[PDB]
Amino acid sequence: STGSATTTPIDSLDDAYITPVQIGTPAQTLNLDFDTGSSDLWVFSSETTASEVXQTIYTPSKSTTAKLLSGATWSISYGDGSSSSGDVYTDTVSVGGLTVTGQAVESAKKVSSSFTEDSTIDGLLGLAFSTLNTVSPTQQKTFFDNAKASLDSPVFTADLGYHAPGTYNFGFIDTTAYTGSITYTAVSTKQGFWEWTSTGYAVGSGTFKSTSIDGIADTGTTLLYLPATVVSAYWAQVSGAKSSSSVGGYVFPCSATLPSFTFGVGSARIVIPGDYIDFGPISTGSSSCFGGIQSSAGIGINIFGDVALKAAFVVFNGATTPTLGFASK
């Protein structure tokens, strides 16, 4: 089997991407953020504290296939400090025509304020390794892990758009979705992430510096977070750019033409167009824009978030030894 679903930016800034997911019988369609940086499929629900719901909710008592996972609970917090918790059902979950039975669907009893405040995100579908799942006492498998037995190939691909719809595919590689060839690179699962080592970078038309950058491919992070020295090298080529303590990162004049940023995948190179590194105005009508490449020093992990990933066709190869592939597009 395979599945193919359209993923859409939630807003004009490409802050996040949502993908429809059908849960239960009859299907309840929720728009979830597919997050390769976590491993829980959780949803706003009929159990969620009413004052914390503003979203489409899952109602397990309306699904004939929902089963309570007795005694199971979950609690998660994310890199941006958001959080949620609740209890656990198993149910039928379909993405893009690919159906998994017995998927753990974590039903939120409570969600943090940023979840309430974001009308467009009805929950998360985690696609990191199942060792990060937060269900206790027994961790639950991701949708991808449960699908692998039936998939035509144990892979999923992310094809995120720049201010445009894109695609998540499960079980196959669409050879018409990218140019050149895919280059694969090794993945370490020691921290549960799609963690890999970039071979280096270049700014604009300058030289490629071979410097190992250990980081994660995270569809659930908006920006590209890289080492401070790398980020400084990038913004040094933008004459108006400066770090702003009050705004919380590099800011620059919206009228600037930004250089591209190239990162290495083995011998291959992925080029992020300059425009992709313009995240957008700090407020509507501002002359100042926030940078799409920021220092990872405060997070402690380098993160190839959506600014990077949307410049590529990205293959998440979930064979027993996983690998990560990148192609230009």
Ligand SMILES: CSC[C@H](NC(=O)[C@H](Cc1ccccc1)NC(=O)N1CCOCC1)C(=O)N[C@@H](CC1CCCCC1)[C@@H](O)C(=O)OC(C)C
């Ligand atoms: C240091 S990593 C910070 C990352 N969050 C983000 O990148 C959020 C995503 C978002 C945008 C709009 C609305 C809601 C959420 N954006 C954000 O913090 N931004 C601040 C900088 O300007 C750009 C937007 C994050 O926590 N990612 C989560 C998934 C994310 C899904 C959406 C809801 C909130 C949680 C996950 O990938 C994670 O924890 O990754 C860690 C392991 C790096």
